[PDB]
């Protein structure tokens, strides 16, 4: 069947939750306080969100 790797037919990017970036274990790259969540990127906050 179709190979998402090399023809651009991705369909599983809806199963990510949180992406965390750290430069040599320093403060996270996304910035100082650029995000509503304190120190990471939040996706698919599905379980519960106030």
């Amino acid at each position: 069947g179709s190979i998402p790797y090399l023809d651009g037919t991705f369909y599983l990017n809806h199963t990510f939750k949180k992406v965390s970036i750290m430069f040599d274990s320093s403060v996270s790259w996304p910035g100082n306080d650029r995000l509503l969540t304190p120190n990471e990127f939040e996706i698919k906050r599905s379980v519960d969100g106030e």
């Binding site: 910035g31 100082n32 306080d33 650029r34 995000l35 509503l36």
Partner: protein, 50 residues
């Protein structure tokens, strides 16, 4: 551009504001907030939403 486009200090990008006072009539809801545009930053009113 690199020189003077965006800050390097700590700043949020999205701010939530809880109502200072609220009035729930039988057919109304009167919520009153206090926008706080701190110094050295400008807010475009099109971004705000309830």
């Amino acid at each position: 551009p690199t020189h003077d486009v965006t800050t390097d200090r700590s700043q949020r990008l999205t701010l939530r504001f809880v109502p200072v006072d609220r009035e729930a009539t039988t057919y109304l809801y009167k919520a009153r907030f206090t926008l706080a545009v701190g110094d050295n930053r400008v807010l475009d009113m099109a971004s705000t939403y309830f």
